[PDB]
Amino acid sequence: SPSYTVLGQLPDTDVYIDIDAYEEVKEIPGIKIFQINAPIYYANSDLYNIHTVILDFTQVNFMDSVGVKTLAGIVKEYGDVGIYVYLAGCSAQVVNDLTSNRFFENPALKELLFHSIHDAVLGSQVREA
């Protein structure tokens, strides 16, 4: 797909890249990591035993209101079956757009933000169930 890329972990590192880019790269059991390559309403249409979905926002420079509403729906619906959706690598600008479009109307959703993918992975290790 051009709109998302599935990432894996280079074993025994904090490096996450395209699962197809290198043979020894492996997905982490229980976690799906998707790099967003196009506005999320696109990647979402493709989407349509996992405890955590990590969305890598490193390539995202801004979000529009349609995208934030789409993301909010993704977070809510996974959440409703107990799966956390983490947002990794959001720029200050992206978090500003999220905020403007009322993504953090419930301030608890700030806990879904992490600076790096590895930070998100570690954050999924132990948390309220």
Q: Which is nearer to Br ion, 7 or 63 (CB)?
A: 63
Tokens of 50: 């996992």
Q: Considering only residues 43, 63, 75, 88, which one is a binding residue for Br ion as defined by CB under 5 A?
A: 63
Q: Which is nearer to Br ion, 75 or 121 (CB)?
A: 75
Which part of the chain contacts Br ion (CB under 5 A), choosing from 35-43, 80-88, 93-101, 117-125?
Answer: 35-43
Q: Considering only residues 27, 32, 38, 39, which one is a binding residue for Br ion as defined by CB under 5 A?
A: 39
Q: Can residue 87 be called a binding residue for Br ion (CB under 5 A)?
A: no
Containing 123, the helix (H) or strand (E) segment is helix 117-123
Q: Can residue 90 be called a binding residue for Br ion (CB under 5 A)?
A: no
Q: Which is nearer to Br ion, 63 or 112 (CB)?
A: 63
Containing 76, the helix (H) or strand (E) segment is helix 65-79
Distance between CA atoms of residues 31 and 9, nearest Å: 11
Distance between CA atoms of residues 37 and 66, nearest Å: 16
Distance between CA atoms of residues 101 and 129, nearest Å: 27
Q: Considering only residues 8, 67, 89, 123, which one is a binding residue for Br ion as defined by CB under 5 A?
A: 67
Q: Which is nearer to Br ion, 48 or 128 (CB)?
A: 48
Residues contacting residue 98 through CB under 8 Å, at least 6 positions apart = 63, 68, 71, 90, 104
Q: What residues line the site for Br ion (CB under 5 A)?
A: 39-40, 63, 67
